């Protein structure tokens, strides 16, 4: 197939794979009003 695509078809070999969705990111609040560390601790990675 590489020979066919390059020699006579004269093109780069097409390569495909399942496209994954964009990463999901939580949207933290700029000012955590009345937000403690224990509650934020669970939400944040550190815990």
């Amino acid at each position: 197939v590489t020979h066919t695509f390059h020699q006579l078809l004269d093109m780069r070999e097409p390569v495909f794979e399942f496209v994954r969705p964009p990463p999901y990111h939580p949207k933290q609040k700029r000012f955590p009003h009345e937000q403690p560390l224990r509650y934020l601790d669970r939400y944040r990675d550190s815990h």
Partner: peptide
């Protein structure tokens, strides 16, 4: 080159493509 033009994602319509791939 006209041949180089290729879509970003492939279009496989074989019913057993997924089954054969697993």
């Amino acid at each position: 080159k006209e041949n180089e033009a290729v879509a970003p994602e492939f279009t496989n319509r074989n019913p057993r493509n997924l089954e054969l791939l697993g």
